[PDB]
């Protein structure tokens, strides 16, 4: 199997842990300690390649060595969306590159209180040249898609 090192970043409270816990446990957590920053492993077949996803769920070596970044905001949190820029500047600085495998994730899609429309998120991901994927860690909508798509963005950038 092949290792892929993934890093989930974004403002406090957006769903990094919930996304990460969904992917691995297939369940939704209401209350995950917002300070717990830790690495999780998951073995999964993605397009016939057995993959070991090594995932840092940041709380706020992986930044330097992480091969791909899920930049998460919550769609019912405008501030978190506006914050994306800073998470991106951080990763560009660390990698000394504008071409970092990256997906922009708009989480909490299940929630009715939408303050960031898909067109805004699409405008942002287009400026950056990255995919935008909408998720809900609660229903699991898009969660596999965000993580797989990040894997695929990593393969697009380098041989794995
Ligand atoms: N309804 C809903 N609540 C969510 C979702 N993701 C996270 N939450 C809630 O938002 C709070 C913060 O989640 P935790 O994100 O994982 O925050 P982070 O790890 O600091 O980004 C918790 O109460 C979660 O249950 C989601 O997709 N839908
Ligand atoms: Mg957390």
UniProtKB/Swiss-Prot annotation:
Activity regulation field: Alternates between an inactive form bound to GDP and an active form bound to GTP. Activated by a guanine nucleotide-exchange factor (GEF) and inactivated by a GTPase-activating protein (GAP). Interaction with SOS1 promotes exchange of bound GDP to GTP.
Quaternary organization: Interacts with PHLPP. Interacts (active GTP-bound form preferentially) with RGS14. Interacts (when farnesylated) with PDE6D; this promotes dissociation from the cell membrane. Interacts with SOS1. Interacts (when farnesylated) with GPR31. Interacts with RAP1GDS1. Interacts (active GTP-bound form) with both SHOC2 and PP1c (all isoforms) to form a tertiary complex; SHOC2 and PP1c preferably bind M-Ras/MRAS, but they also bind K-Ras/KRAS, N-Ras/NRAS and H-Ras/HRAS. Interacts (GTP-bound form) with MAPKAP1/SIN1; inhibiting K-Ras/KRAS activity.
Documented effect of changing residue 38 to A: Decreased interaction with MAPKAP1/SIN1
Domain of life: Eukaryota
Effect of mutating residue 19 to F: In OES; somatic mutation
Keywords, comma-separated and alphabetical: Acetylation, Cardiomyopathy, Cell membrane, Cytoplasm, Deafness, Disease variant, Ectodermal dysplasia, Glycoprotein, GTP-binding, Hydrolase, Intellectual disability, Isopeptide bond, Lipoprotein, Membrane, Methylation, Nucleotide-binding, Palmitate, Prenylation, Proto-oncogene, Ubl conjugation
Protein name: GTPase KRas
Binding site for GTP: 10-18, 29-35, 59-60, 107-110
Cell compartment(s), UniProt: Cell membrane; Endomembrane system; Cytoplasm, Cytosol
Membrane topology category: Lipid-anchor
Keyword Cell inner membrane: no
